[PDB]
């Protein structure tokens, strides 16, 4: 009846979009950065190793001062470390021992954590009574929390395993808005430098660009062949990079609305767990299932370096806002800082 | 400098207090065994939760040993992204309804799920306790001539019950044959790629007088012992 007819319209629109993208695809980035001088080899050596987590770490997030960081592990702990002096500043137990994400507020007053409880917990760091306590338990998702980011000290954006993203209001713990359209579990999330848009990656091998205030999907990006595990905006917010289980990273442009580079090598057959950029955007760092990290020249798609100090799967990767140090976290329960 | 020295001293003291608390928490964590319960809609899984958000907790204590069992609820049927959480679990209790060979085939779906769990690259060192549930339903299904394992498992024709079987008294041989056929259908998957790092521990149960926690306790003890023996080159 109604079906098997409107799908013809959908196919026609897909054909028209693909034809327009093919027409707009004038040249390639490979034949524009042909003369760009390669970075060569890059040696970054571990400087700190942070010990204290009993089980594997899933998430880490730097602070805006590029000094403090927070890490989440399955022994039920959220640990706030001082990257300088290797000291521990805070240790917070959790009601649920199964956490998959942690976020640190830009102001430095709150942290947030999630997990298989389908609840986002907000912890207050600056209080006069006691030391730390949970101030809000955002509930309403019907799947596991996979990522969460702070927009302000009052708003938060979460992604779940129920294929929907949500924007909350921490003052009252209410779902301000819901972003729908993904057909698979939403795994990653990245905020634009101006915090006006945000990109999400899911398990249907597609990325989506959302406008925060209106709640609609501006653009859909395809090209990956498997689940997307990580996303990161470019420093200027006009492009982003994705990592997938098909053992390749990709670069997408928002204005051109298509792919620019694929970063892969025949020696890699393991999926990417995390991606991040450098301060100037020349270097793209990726963490893999084969226990290593690879540093790619983001303009020429040649592997420029390797960070190898881990014994298990590497799952966390982050770069400071100063562009000074990188932090990696692995399933062997160790946090490492490189430079 | 004086402010810097004072701040350094205060930070060191706070770190020391955190270290003491973390040491106590590690001593607690090392002595607690965590289990993952895994079943289906009607496979059982609720008579084991009985009689001792998005995840349901169960604490119990047998012979002064603590066990924490984690039942997955309010999570949809796709599992390839959250199953990887349970790679450091001491055991996965997989419950299967044995009489459901009549989706029109739930036993075959259970076999497929067990195959996926067994061959996962992140679950290479996790042992599976396998509970073949609802023996009574299978007994009254096989005693009658309503439905046959044959034409759903065509190799059931040339299957002979083993000589090592220990049937309960009052059990027909043609029921023991079906029970051990299901058990061997699971063991064919289990023993093809064990490699010595993990093992299956099949069991038969319908509703037993709290023998199930004893079976779990014994299987966990055997798992720890086999791990140590493999570590010391004795196995």
């Amino acid at each position: 009846s109604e079906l098997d007819q409107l799908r013809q319209e959908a196919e026609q629109l897909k054909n028209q979009i693909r034809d327009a993208r093919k027409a707009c695809a004038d040249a390639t980035l490979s034949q524009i950065t042909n003369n760009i001088d390669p970075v060569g080899r890059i040696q970054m050596r571990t400087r700190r190793t942070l010990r204290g987590h009993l089980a594997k770490i899933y998430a880490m997030h730097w602070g805006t001062d590029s000094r403090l960081l927070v890490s989440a592990s399955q022994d039920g702990k959220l640990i706030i470390w001082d990257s300088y002096t290797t000291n521990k500043v805070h240790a917070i137990p959790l009601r649920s021992s199964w956490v998959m994400t942690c976020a640190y507020a830009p102001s430095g007053n709150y942290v947030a954590c999630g997990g298989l409880d389908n609840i986002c917990s907000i912890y207050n760091l600056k209080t006069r009574e006691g030391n730390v306590r949970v101030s809000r338990e955002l509930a309403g998702h019907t799947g596991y929390l996979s990522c969460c980011r702070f927009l302000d000290d009052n708003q938060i954006v979460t992604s779940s395993g129920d294929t929907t993203c949500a924007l909350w209001d921490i003052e009252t713990g209410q779902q301000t808005t819901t972003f729908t359209g993904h057909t698979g579990d939403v795994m990653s999330l990245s905020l634009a430098p101006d915090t006006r848009l945000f990109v999400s990656g899911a398990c249907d091998a597609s990325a989506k660009l959302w406008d925060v205030r209106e709640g609609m999907c501006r653009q859909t990006f395809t090209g990956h062949e498997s689940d997307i595990n990580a996303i990161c905006f470019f420093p200027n917010g006009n492009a982003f990079a994705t990592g997938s289980d098909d053992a390749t990273c990709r670069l997408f442009d928002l204005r051109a609305d298509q792919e620019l580079m694929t970063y892969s090598h025949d020696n890699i057959i393991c999926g990417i767990t995390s991606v991040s950029f450098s301060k100037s955007g020349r270097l793209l760092l990726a963490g893999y299932d084969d226990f290593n990290c690879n540093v790619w020249d983001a303009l020429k798609a040649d592997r420029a370096g390797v960070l190898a100090g881990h014994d298990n799967r590497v799952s966390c990767l982050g770069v400071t806002d100063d562009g000074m140090a990188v932090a990696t976290g692995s399933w062997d329960s160790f946090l490492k800082i490189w430079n | 400098t004086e402010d810097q020295r004072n701040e350094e001293k205060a930070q060191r003291e706070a770190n020391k207090k955190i270290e003491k608390q973390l040491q106590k928490d590690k001593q607690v964590y090392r002595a607690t065994h965590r289990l993952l319960l895994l079943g289906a809609g009607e496979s059982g899984k609720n008579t084991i939760v009985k009689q001792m958000s998005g995840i349901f907790e169960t604490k119990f204590q047998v012979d002064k040993v603590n066990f924490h069992m984690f039942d997955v609820g309010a999570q949809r049927d796709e599992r390839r992204k959250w199953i990887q959480c349970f790679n450091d679990v001491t055991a996965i209790i997989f419950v299967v309804a044995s009489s459901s060979y009549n989706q029109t085939n739930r036993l075959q779906a259970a076999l497929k799920l067990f195959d996926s769990i067994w061959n996962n690259k992140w679950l290479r060192d996790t042992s599976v306790i396998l509970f073949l549930n609802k023996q009574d339903l299978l007994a009254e299904k096989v005693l009658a001539g309503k439905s046959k394992i044959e034409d759903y498992f065509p190799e059931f024709a040339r299957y002979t019950t083993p000589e090592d079987a220990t049937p309960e008294p009052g059990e027909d041989p043609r029921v023991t044959r079906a029970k051990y056929f299901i058990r061997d259908e699971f063991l064919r998957i289990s023993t093809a790629s064990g490699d010595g790092r993990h093992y299956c521990y099949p069991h038969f149960t319908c509703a037993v007088d709290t023998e199930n926690i004893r079976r779990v306790f014994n299987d966990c003890r055997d798992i720890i012992q086999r791990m140590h023996l493999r570590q010391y080159e004795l196995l």
Partner: nanobody, 128 residues
Framework: QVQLQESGGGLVQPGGSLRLSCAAS????????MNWVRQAPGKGLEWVSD????????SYTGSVKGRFTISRDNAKNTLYLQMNSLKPEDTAVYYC?????????????????????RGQGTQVTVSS
């Protein structure tokens, strides 16, 4: 975009034969293990058959052994299913599913509803 199109199938008398085909595009077909799944009316999705990366390892359900044959061609990016002897209880929609990840020997969620890497499905009905 990962796309799969199933072709063939339809109305056939009992004892007839069909040859379902599945054309895949958007991914390297030789890196993945393929499946045929089916859904009968008023019932859930049921795994039917699968084939490995090189075609060496093949498997079926108990109810279709000796009648259904799965095949695949890597140079033509195609997956075939030959149904030789058909019965009233074979009336169903047949889907061509793909494993979520390459180079892995496990295959988790090809049977769950709302699975991304599945085809549209072709209807096979045996009536008379």
């Amino acid at each position: 975009q990962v796309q799969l199109q199933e072709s063939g199938g339809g109305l056939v008398q009992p004892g007839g034969s069909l040859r379902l085909s599945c054309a895949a595009s958007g991914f390297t077909f030789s890196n993945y293990k393929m499946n045929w799944v089916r859904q009968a009316p008023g019932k859930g999705l049921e795994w039917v058959s699968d084939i490995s990366q090189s075609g060496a390892s093949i498997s079926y359900t108990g109810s279709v052994k000796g009648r259904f044959t799965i095949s695949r061609d890597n140079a033509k990016n195609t997956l075939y299913l030959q149904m030789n002897s058909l019965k009233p209880e074979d009336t169903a929609v047949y889907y061509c599913a793909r494993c979520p990840a390459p180079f892995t020997r496990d295959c988790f969620d090809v049977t769950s509803t709302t699975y991304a890497y599945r085809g549209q499905g072709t209807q096979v009905t045996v009536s008379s």
